[PDB]
């Protein structure tokens, strides 16, 4: 009837890719985060920001290419193309590291626009919105690492660059400087990721091994029409199996599939709380009862004090080349070496 | 070491001496458990989304499943039409058997491949090494991200077992 | 129209037998004519270091960062 | 009309000429440490 109704009926039309209202936020912003990454890893260097090479023009393969974080002198500037740093020039915008905030900002509005996509399709199909709530897990890892972690730090420079090996140094930068593995929020996150991979490997292998005979063929994939009301696997058998192997087992398909949602997602929320606590440098660095004892008793050694000496090697050896803006000129005689290494 | 801090003594010393992160079999099992926790929470949400009304709003959602029943407890056509619009139509498994097989394939193949990464790196066939790989025409070494990753490996290598070594190369 | 009925048709491969090589070679000429080094400011292998500047160039200012990169890219 | 397996054959070996070209330039040109 009205003008709003014609636009509402056009976006929600059955077509190849469902656009909806949320596609106006997703499809422009996701196309430019992805294309900003493919351009930045192919053409744009890191020679002026980090003093590296992170492009395909500079000989890096898929692994050692990245879209890199800007300089520490930029601080937390948004680095707009028209801004006071770039001033409209495209070429000087790329050399300062403007594509990285271009990827991260238009990417953050892609994950907004993709989670709104999951509320919109669920309302048209008419189902409960648990996909949009389980996808809030990965939103809490993008925001609290690519956004909330460099905000608490000195600049955008201490953020993960969007490249394969550039994530890998961020894994190593976070052990030596922060002792991230000791943090109980990672420990509750590893329990959800390795726990979530566990549940789909079991529920994959128990459904597929309690199937009913619905055909004479040896292939069991053929014997399932999608619109049938009979269940395709014996729940009573699978309960009787695991009650004797493992001792305790699900007797509820509604509780089972909810539990496959809770376990992976909670590991992304609990691990997201800790990385917000490392923006503020509130790290779980030491057990002081272990540290006061190892100072007074020069014979008491645990595995825990062995990890601190591994972190002095990370804090001293890479920090010269890690942070060229700070100009660490270490002598050879201050770098902690071991015996004969 | 059978412990918790002993595990991270094991992982870091294994990084300096073998470069596991650049090895493509740790790469094929990070994809196994990131993918595994994806398809876990992606399958577990689409079943819980499409549950059939069998309870009231006062009692629990889970009590609409009586144990050992023969009726199907969720509209599988509903969750197929949702994911058939969330990405596109042809990327959706209408077959629930082939769906519940792909949940068992992806992690297990990812951990078979990974556990034969530790095995082939037990015999000192390490991961990739792209240190000093990018040079200018003059021949000076241009750093990459692998050179920054190398300086993290050199810090752990010169500090692990700080008294056990006597000779310049950690052959063990 | 179904997708597999498109790519098996001849009229599809009539059009895209011209457009694909005319677009792949334009991606070749975008590099071999030295154009990509000037749009994105990526250093050529000749020009990581210069005769004067022998160190690693870094930006060291918030607001005159455009002017400082005008310095480090002339020589 | 073209048989579909001919299409996946010609495009499939075209990818191999693209991939093995990329593993070629890991040992030559830039990024080869020569």
């Amino acid at each position: 009837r009205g003008l709003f109704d014609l636009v509402d009926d056009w976006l929600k039309k059955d077509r190849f890719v469902f656009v909806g209202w949320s596609g106006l936020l997703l499809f422009p912003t996701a196309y430019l985060a992805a294309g900003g990454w493919m351009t930045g890893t192919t053409f744009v260097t890191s020679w002026y920001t980090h003093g590296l090479a992170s492009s395909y023009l500079e000989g890096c393969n898929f692994l050692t290419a990245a879209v890199s974080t800007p300089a520490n002198s930029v601080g937390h500037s948004l680095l707009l193309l028209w801004g006071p740093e770039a001033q409209g020039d495209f070429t000087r915008w790329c050399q300062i590291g403007g594509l990285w905030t271009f990827v991260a900002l238009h990417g953050a509005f892609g994950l907004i626009g993709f989670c709104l996509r999951q509320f919109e399709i669920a309302r048209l199909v008419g189902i409960r919105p648990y996909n949009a709530i389980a996808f809030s897990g990965p939103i809490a890892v993008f925001v609290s690492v690519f956004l909330l972690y460099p905000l608490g730090q000195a600049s955008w420079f201490f953020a993960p660059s969007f490249g394969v090996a550039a994530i890998f140094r961020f894994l190593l930068f976070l052990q030596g400087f922060h002792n991230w593995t000791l943090n109980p929020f990672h420990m509750m996150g590893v329990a959800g990721i390795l726990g979530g991979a566990l549940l789909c490997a079991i529920h994959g292998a128990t459904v597929e091994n309690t199937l009913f005979e619905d055909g004479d063929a040896a292939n069991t994939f053929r014997a399932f029409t999608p619109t049938q009301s009979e269940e395709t696997y014996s729940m009573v058998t699978a309960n009787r199996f695991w009650s004797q192997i493992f001792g305790v087992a699900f007797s509820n398909k509604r509780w089972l599939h909810f539990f496959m949602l809770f376990v992976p997602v909670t590991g992304l929320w609990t691990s997201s709380i800790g990385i917000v606590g490392l923006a503020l440098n509130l790290r779980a660095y030491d057990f002081v009862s272990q540290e006061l004892r190892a100072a007074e008793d020069p014979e008491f050694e645990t595995f825990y004090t062995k990890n601190h000496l591994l972190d002095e090697g990370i804090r001293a050896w890479m920090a010269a080349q890690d942070q060229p803006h700070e100009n660490f000129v270490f002598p050879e005689e201050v770098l902690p070496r071991g015996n004969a290494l | 070491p059978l412990g918790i801090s002993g595990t991270f003594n094991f992982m870091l010393v294994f990084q300096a001496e073998h470069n596991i992160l650049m090895h493509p079999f740790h790469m094929a099992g990070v994809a196994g458990v990131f993918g595994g926790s994806l398809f876990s929470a992606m399958h577990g949400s689409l079943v819980t989304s499409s549950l059939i009304r069998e309870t009231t709003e006062n009692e629990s959602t889970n009590y609409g499943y009586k144990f050992g029943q023969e009726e199907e407890t969720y509209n599988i056509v509903a969750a197929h039409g949702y994911f058939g619009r969330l990405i596109f139509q042809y990327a959706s498994f209408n077959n629930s058997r082939a769906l519940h097989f792909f949940l068992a394939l992806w992690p297990v193949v990812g951990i078979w491949i990974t556990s034969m990464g530790i095995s082939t790196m037990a015999f000192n066939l390490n991961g990739f090494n792209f240190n000093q790989s990018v040079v200018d025409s003059q021949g000076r070494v241009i750093n990459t991200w692998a050179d920054i990753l190398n300086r993290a490996n050199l810090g752990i290598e010169v500090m692990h077992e700080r008294n056990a070594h006597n000779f310049p190369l950690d052959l063990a | 129209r179904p997708f597999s009925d498109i790519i098996t048709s001849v009229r599809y491969w009539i059009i895209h037998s011209i457009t694909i090589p005319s677009l792949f070679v334009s991606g070749w000429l975008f590099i071999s004519t030295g154009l990509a080094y000037d749009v994105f400011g990526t250093p050529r292998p000749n020009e990581y270091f210069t005769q004067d500047r022998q160190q690693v160039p870094l930006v060291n200012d918030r607001f005159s960062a455009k002017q400082e990169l005008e310095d480090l890219t002339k020589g | 009309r073209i048989p579909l397996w001919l299409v996946g054959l010609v495009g499939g070996l075209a990818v191999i000429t693209m991939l093995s070209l990329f593993f070629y330039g890991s040992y030559s040109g830039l990024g080869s440490s020569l």
Partner: peptide, 28 residues
């Protein structure tokens, strides 16, 4: 029409692969 949907993703992809094959033959 879906010619704008695919070719927003495929016309760039062949253009960048025209550049990635050219970078294999560039040396110092």
């Amino acid at each position: 029409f879906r010619w704008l949907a695919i070719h927003g993703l495929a016309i760039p992809t062949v253009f960048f692969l025209g550049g990635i094959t050219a970078m294999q033959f560039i040396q110092r």
